[PDB]
Amino acid sequence: HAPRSSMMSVEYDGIPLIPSVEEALSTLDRAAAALNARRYRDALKLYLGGANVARQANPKICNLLTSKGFETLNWCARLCDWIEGRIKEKHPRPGVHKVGIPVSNWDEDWVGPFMDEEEARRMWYTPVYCPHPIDFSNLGYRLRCVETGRRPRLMICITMYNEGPQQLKATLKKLANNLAYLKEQMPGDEKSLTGAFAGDDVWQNVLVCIVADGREQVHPKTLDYLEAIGLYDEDLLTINSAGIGAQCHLFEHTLQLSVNGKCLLPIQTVFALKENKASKLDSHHWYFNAFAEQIQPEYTAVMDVGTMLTKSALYHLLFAFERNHQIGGACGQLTVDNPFENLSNWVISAQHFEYKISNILDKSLESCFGFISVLPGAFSAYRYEAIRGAPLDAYFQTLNIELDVLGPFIGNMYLAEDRILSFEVVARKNCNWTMHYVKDAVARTDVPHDLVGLISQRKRWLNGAFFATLFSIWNWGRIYSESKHTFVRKMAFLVFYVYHLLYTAFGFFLPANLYLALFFIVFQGFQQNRLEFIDTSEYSQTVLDCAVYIYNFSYLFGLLMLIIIGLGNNPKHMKLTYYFVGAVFGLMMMLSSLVGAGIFFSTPATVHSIVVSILTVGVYFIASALHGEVHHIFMTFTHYTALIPSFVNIFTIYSFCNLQDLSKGDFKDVIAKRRALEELRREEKERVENRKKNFEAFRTNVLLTWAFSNLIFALFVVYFASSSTYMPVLYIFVASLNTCRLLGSIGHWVYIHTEGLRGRV
Amino acid sequence: HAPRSSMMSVEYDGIPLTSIPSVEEALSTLDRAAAALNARRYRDALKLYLEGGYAMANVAERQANPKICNLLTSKGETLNWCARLCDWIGRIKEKHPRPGVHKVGIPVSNWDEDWVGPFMDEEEARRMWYTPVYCPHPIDFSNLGYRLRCVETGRRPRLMICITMYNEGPQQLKATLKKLANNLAYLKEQMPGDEKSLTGAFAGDDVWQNVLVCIVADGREQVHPKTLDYLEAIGLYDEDLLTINSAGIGAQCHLFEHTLQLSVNGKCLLPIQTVFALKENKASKLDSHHWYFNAFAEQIQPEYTAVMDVGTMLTKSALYHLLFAFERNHQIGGACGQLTVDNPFENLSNWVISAQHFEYKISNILDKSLESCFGFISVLPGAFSAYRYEAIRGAPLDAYFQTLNIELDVLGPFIGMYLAEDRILSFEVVARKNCNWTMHYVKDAVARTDVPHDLVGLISQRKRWLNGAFFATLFSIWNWGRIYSESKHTFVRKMAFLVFYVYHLLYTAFGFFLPANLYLALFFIVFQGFQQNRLEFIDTSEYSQTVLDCAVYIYNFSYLFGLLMLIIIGLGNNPKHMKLTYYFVGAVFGLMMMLSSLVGAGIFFSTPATVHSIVVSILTVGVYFIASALHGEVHHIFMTFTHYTALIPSFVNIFTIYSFCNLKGDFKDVIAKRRALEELRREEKERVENRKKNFEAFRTNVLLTWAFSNLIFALFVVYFASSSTYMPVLYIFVASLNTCRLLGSIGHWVYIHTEGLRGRV
Ligand SMILES: O=c1ccn([C@@H]2O[C@H](COP(=O)(O)OP(=O)(O)O)[C@@H](O)[C@H]2O)c(=O)[nH]1
Numbered sequence A: 001h002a003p004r005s006s007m008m009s010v011e012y013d014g015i016p017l018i019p020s021v022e023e024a025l026s027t028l029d030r031a032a033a034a035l036n037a038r039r040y041r042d043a044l045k046l047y048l049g050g051a052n053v054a055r056q057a058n059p060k061i062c063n064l065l066t067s068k069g070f071e072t073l074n075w076c077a078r079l080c081d082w083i084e085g086r087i088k089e090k091h092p093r094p095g096v097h098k099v100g101i102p103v104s105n106w107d108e109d110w111v112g113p114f115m116d117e118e119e120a121r122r123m124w125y126t127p128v129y130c131p132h133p134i135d136f137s138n139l140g141y142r143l144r145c146v147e148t149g150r151r152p153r154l155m156i157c158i159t160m161y162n163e164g165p166q167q168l169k170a171t172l173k174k175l176a177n178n179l180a181y182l183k184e185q186m187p188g189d190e191k192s193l194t195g196a197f198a199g200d201d202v203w204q205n206v207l208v209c210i211v212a213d214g215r216e217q218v219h220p221k222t223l224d225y226l227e228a229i230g231l232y233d234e235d236l237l238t239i240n241s242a243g244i245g246a247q248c249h250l251f252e253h254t255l256q257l258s259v260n261g262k263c264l265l266p267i268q269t270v271f272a273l274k275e276n277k278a279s280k281l282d283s284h285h286w287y288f289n290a291f292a293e294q295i296q297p298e299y300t301a302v303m304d305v306g307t308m309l310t311k312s313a314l315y316h317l318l319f320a321f322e323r324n325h326q327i328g329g330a331c332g333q334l335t336v337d338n339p340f341e342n343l344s345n346w347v348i349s350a351q352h353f354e355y356k357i358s359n360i361l362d363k364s365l366e367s368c369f370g371f372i373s374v375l376p377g378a379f380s381a382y383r384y385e386a387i388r389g390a391p392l393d394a395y396f397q398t399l400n401i402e403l404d405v406l407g408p409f410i411g412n413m414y415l416a417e418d419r420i421l422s423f424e425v426v427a428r429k430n431c432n433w434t435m436h437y438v439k440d441a442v443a444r445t446d447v448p449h450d451l452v453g454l455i456s457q458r459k460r461w462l463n464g465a466f467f468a469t470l471f472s473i474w475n476w477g478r479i480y481s482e483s484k485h486t487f488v489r490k491m492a493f494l495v496f497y498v499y500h501l502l503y504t505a506f507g508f509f510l511p512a513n514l515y516l517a518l519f520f521i522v523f524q525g526f527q528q529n530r531l532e533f534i535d536t537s538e539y540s541q542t543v544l545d546c547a548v549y550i551y552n553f554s555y556l557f558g559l560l561m562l563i564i565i566g567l568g569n570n571p572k573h574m575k576l577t578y579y580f581v582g583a584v585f586g587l588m589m590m591l592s593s594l595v596g597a598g599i600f601f602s603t604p605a606t607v608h609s610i611v612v613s614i615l616t617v618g619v620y621f622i623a624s625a626l627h628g629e630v631h632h633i634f635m636t637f638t639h640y641t642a643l644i645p646s647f648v649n650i651f652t653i654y655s656f657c658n659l660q661d662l663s664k665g666d667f668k669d670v671i672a673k674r675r676a677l678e679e680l681r682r683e684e685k686e687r688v689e690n691r692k693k694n695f696e697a698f699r700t701n702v703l704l705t706w707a708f709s710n711l712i713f714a715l716f717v718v719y720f721a722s723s724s725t726y727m728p729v730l731y732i733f734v735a736s737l738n739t740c741r742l743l744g745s746i747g748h749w750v751y752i753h754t755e756g757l758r759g760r761v
Numbered sequence B: 001h002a003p004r005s006s007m008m009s010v011e012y013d014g015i016p017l018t019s020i021p022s023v024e025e026a027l028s029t030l031d032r033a034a035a036a037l038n039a040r041r042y043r044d045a046l047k048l049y050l051e052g053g054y055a056m057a058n059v060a061e062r063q064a065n066p067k068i069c070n071l072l073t074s075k076g077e078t079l080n081w082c083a084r085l086c087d088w089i090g091r092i093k094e095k096h097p098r099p100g101v102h103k104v105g106i107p108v109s110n111w112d113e114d115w116v117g118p119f120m121d122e123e124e125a126r127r128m129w130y131t132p133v134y135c136p137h138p139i140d141f142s143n144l145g146y147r148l149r150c151v152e153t154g155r156r157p158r159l160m161i162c163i164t165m166y167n168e169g170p171q172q173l174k175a176t177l178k179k180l181a182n183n184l185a186y187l188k189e190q191m192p193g194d195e196k197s198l199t200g201a202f203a204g205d206d207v208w209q210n211v212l213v214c215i216v217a218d219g220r221e222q223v224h225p226k227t228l229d230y231l232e233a234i235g236l237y238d239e240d241l242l243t244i245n246s247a248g249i250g251a252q253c254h255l256f257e258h259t260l261q262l263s264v265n266g267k268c269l270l271p272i273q274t275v276f277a278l279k280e281n282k283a284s285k286l287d288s289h290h291w292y293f294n295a296f297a298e299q300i301q302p303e304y305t306a307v308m309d310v311g312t313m314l315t316k317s318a319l320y321h322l323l324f325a326f327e328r329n330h331q332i333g334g335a336c337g338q339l340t341v342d343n344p345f346e347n348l349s350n351w352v353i354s355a356q357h358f359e360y361k362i363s364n365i366l367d368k369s370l371e372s373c374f375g376f377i378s379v380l381p382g383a384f385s386a387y388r389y390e391a392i393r394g395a396p397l398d399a400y401f402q403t404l405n406i407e408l409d410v411l412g413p414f415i416g417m418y419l420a421e422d423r424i425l426s427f428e429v430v431a432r433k434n435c436n437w438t439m440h441y442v443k444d445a446v447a448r449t450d451v452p453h454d455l456v457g458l459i460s461q462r463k464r465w466l467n468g469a470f471f472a473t474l475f476s477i478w479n480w481g482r483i484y485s486e487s488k489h490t491f492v493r494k495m496a497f498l499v500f501y502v503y504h505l506l507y508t509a510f511g512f513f514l515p516a517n518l519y520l521a522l523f524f525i526v527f528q529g530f531q532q533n534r535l536e537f538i539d540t541s542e543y544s545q546t547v548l549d550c551a552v553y554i555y556n557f558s559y560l561f562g563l564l565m566l567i568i569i570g571l572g573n574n575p576k577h578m579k580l581t582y583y584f585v586g587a588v589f590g591l592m593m594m595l596s597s598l599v600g601a602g603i604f605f606s607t608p609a610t611v612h613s614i615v616v617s618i619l620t621v622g623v624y625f626i627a628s629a630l631h632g633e634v635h636h637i638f639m640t641f642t643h644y645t646a647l648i649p650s651f652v653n654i655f656t657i658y659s660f661c662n663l664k665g666d667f668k669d670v671i672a673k674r675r676a677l678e679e680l681r682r683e684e685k686e687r688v689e690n691r692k693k694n695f696e697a698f699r700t701n702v703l704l705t706w707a708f709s710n711l712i713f714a715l716f717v718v719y720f721a722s723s724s725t726y727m728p729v730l731y732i733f734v735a736s737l738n739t740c741r742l743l744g745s746i747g748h749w750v751y752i753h754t755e756g757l758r759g760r761v
């Protein structure tokens, strides 16, 4: 008991015994929050932040703070009058005030046609509150183009989010090259453009709109570059956006760019940096709704950040748009930059081959029928007459209506919604807008050089592609039900719909078909003595079954590991495992390719065999030679064929794995407010949990359907079909698909090379 | 051009019209002052605290409620703290100033006029004591001046009970408190002056003073509103008092103290010395135990410390049996009570509840008896376990809370082991340096809890349980050398621990390959008795020869498809929206079990029942009934054998798969502060991403190891072993394990029934 008494006696003995600018910014931020919550008395009090500090020795900061204080005091007077009621107005907000500060860097040595000092030397900036970008023009926001009276006929969007300065600099240099090429067209000839895109004035009619995604995620080097080109200012942003509470901040500057001894054409640029992170869909929402509804361009082009365009990409797009007068939208060719260089990388070469083949075959076939599912990230352009209303409304339905009402089906559909916009353009009511694919308007992008980055990219691509394909398949009746196309166009669309259904059905069972083809040809030619270049009649009879058993077990274990990994961890720490699986599949397909080549060469090459082989495999080379670019295929065929199983299995599995990856009161009044806030928090948590439950349930159901359909098809073919009664069917199906694609490419080539001469009729 | 001019003229015409305090205000200002003081900005903290104090002083007069008026006047304490902080800013030197602690007791709203008690004073009976606590690291809870009513009144508790509660209905808490009062009444009613009853601090008429029941909540945002209403009813929570007195303190949790009086029908329950520590921010049960153990135990310094979850009803003699064990043994470093499902006889139609009851009874009897024979128990999660605060004081608790003290990044994914760290506390108590503490299992101290009645709830619970059990088992296996390396046990104890370590290694190795062993056993016995004519009660010699292989093929395909679906679903979506799928798989496995069960019974009854067969069958299966009859409770097993047998494969496969599958500055200073905050946020995001990457990578690696080890073992047994060369081995292994468990149960029974008579020697 002595330790207890000692401790308690110890406790008993231990028992006895000028304002600031940051303050102004915080108070204005609180006032903005109070005004957001509609507490006008407190908002007026805290706003009256509004003059004593502007002690600053820096002339620019002193002027900015003086102007901000004066504007805030004027706004306080306006709000006080509003509360007094002598001025009646709906939803009061601080007045729109854009501040033009002299740019930090201006080049004394620069060459331009003609320009004014106010536009050239000074940079304009305005923070905007617009919650719904439709009433951007209603709240009084204007752009320098509108203020100066320039009426841009074409606008371009460059969505940018966490990129280095090099990509943006390359994109802007390429755009300047495009503008220079548009300037240098010879007048008074048949081929060149005429009208608003002539020389010496083309730079005024094109506006390049850079939409960021989040002030918290853009690269500091990116911001340093933007300040260097004279389009960003942290001090100006912080001073002039203190109490406005802007959702996005837009800076306007017709920036001048110089490269070596050649000074690029000035580019009319608007850069909308948005405060809260959102999706590329939200960036397009801001861009399209606000800026398009304001200046109303004739053509609207969209490209990602890092896509380098040739000198004639914009020229070819505009030429197509003017000469056709029917195209409701078009997209340029997507190409990997420097394909010849760095040929040692297999992933880069495989991506190059995939892009070239996809473009040529699929895009030519789809452009023949006037409906093209644009590749994600491709440099696509539309005309703002086929997109004005219902197409854009459908495009942004996901943002306008919360994901709970739509469901998971619509959300996964709108993951890559550029295809949805394309379909809505094609099937717009009471209008016949077809689509087009421009071969010569090549837009060079920079694809990932690692298998893990390729895996993530192809996951998002395949998710969007699959569900947009489902949308088109289910809603294809709208083309005949609502649109007014020609009867020939309706029949062509019906034929393409039949082809699309067959192609999508084949691609759904692609893993099962690939497994069956490899198994049958290679391993049941080896086991059952069907490889014409070798006699395995007797052998040991242990290796004969050992080959099939090893192949089956390796394939099944690889598929199980792939499913587990794709369902689980992010494919960035599994680089070694994914490289191992990809290398195993690649080596297996090189073995299969040599086995198939041996079989084809040892076969006495009957007429049916040679026709099928041509029409199945050599269709790639035939279409490439027709289009004039065959060296790319010649170089990248082996690299891509080494990556066919990785592509099919890994990418399809991972894409299907993550379908759910989607973005003066008293004390009684105080207690009631606390209870209401707690209840709203609980309801929001429950609603988010229900959203996640529905999304994950749909993901798992669709994944189970896909995987078990493939497994059941493979088992029923293996157990109930021989190589002689299935492989002819597979060859017929693949030959039919490649025949349709070859006919499409032939039609696209003949259309391009013939429509010029037959333009009179 | 006409509509363009029309719209631009419309915009031009639209161009006209470029260059008395409040209590809520007082609470908000005090909260801001608390935040500023947390940020160590003493000038701003002093200003805001002064404003809040004066605001409360002015507001309190206008309140009509006498309680709120007096309480707000008293709180407007804040002015005294303001004076202290102003003096601190140097005539008073003090390190880390904070508002002085102040506990305020308001009369309880409801006091029972008709109530019977031994003797009590009005101050403790009618008044409820409350104090908010800042203490961040609960070790210096006593250093900051915080005291409990037991310490203030001089009552010196010797047993302290913890009831962790989080999002629970009033009924569970009321049942737990009623059962605790029943235990206190039973401790009162012990006959003095006899051999059996306890002597000393737990005698009659005063035992209620020596026991403190500490209720620790987990979050004020998650506790049930009905739970809070019940707490007000028993007079232990006051929302107004909390909201006012916790304004500027910024307490991490709020503790209320009340010797609550409970009445049930015409019988008045014993008063319970209760402390209710409600945590402001949500945390884990580990953090709840951190607060409980460190703060309260280090303060009052108990003799025994008991831990129970909420909803666990104890019989009248649970505490008596635990304290009898602790007093009479004088060596037990910790004990755990029996875990039992309430009302097992009732609702026998539910299969999941019955299976859980059978699992609890068999696990308790067999495993806990065997472990208590050897003095080392892996405590079941949620069980009513108790320790003595002499074997837990230092290193065991430090190891227990290592996860909280050191962030999971340094520890790794293996250590994050501490999901269920009660086993870790058990092992650290057993292997504490320089002292020999063993554990014990109290059969008669039954703690009845309430299990989930749905397969999905069972799945989640068993995921938690299996996760903790597996990694605590790995810890014990890897660190079992510490018992001989550091502890001072008897040589016989060291040898017993070595024998138990060998048994534990074998048992864990067998349980790791449990799915593969179950699949092989079912496959071999049932389907390779049916296909190969080994079922002694039927002759399948000729048959159709198509159904003979069809049975094996159907079983294999169904098992593999079910396993794949289970992996995908478990590892993917949350098992709450897949109730139908999980019930389907469970029903399939239960029907398969039924088939296997009757097939095995037929095989045994048709076999001529040789001596080896009967011995193996008895010792393998009837070991359950033998141990149950020895312990006197055999009716439970007799009624629940079939119910648990139907759920063996669901248990093993589903639960194991889910558990393993989810492992005064200027603007330059302001800009520098913004940049520092951005960089800190980015580094925190990167650190969280790295944590998740390592965590998921370890999860997937262990899952792949487990699944592929099971698959490879199953394939190598199927292809390279016959039923005659593997099933004898499986029978021998399981027979050995059940022999060890039966011997353990027999030893525990004989120890309990013999140690009393042989206590002299
Ligand atoms: O959350 C995001 C991620 C990306 N982006 C942008 O939207 C386009 C997405 O293409 P990305 O470059 O991510 O795909 P890639 O070209 O790398 O395959 C690019 O302009 C991105 O900067 C966006 O707006 N929000």
Ligand SMILES: O=c1ccn([C@@H]2O[C@H](COP(=O)(O)OP(=O)(O)O)[C@@H](O)[C@H]2O)c(=O)[nH]1
Pocket: B164, B165, B166, B167, B168, B218, B283, B284, B285, B286, B288, B308, B309, B310, B382, B461
């Ligand atoms: O985040 C949590 C979840 C639970 N608990 C409590 O800690 C114990 C965890 O046991 P649980 O109820 O999860 O297990 P069960 O009884 O449901 O099988 C119970 O007292 C819970 O109320 C907690 O402190 N924090």
Ligand SMILES: [Mn+2]
Pocket: A304, A305, A306, A377, A445, A446
């Ligand atoms: Mn890109």
Ligand SMILES: [Mn+2]
Pocket: B309, B310, B311, B382, B449, B450
């Ligand atoms: Mn519970």
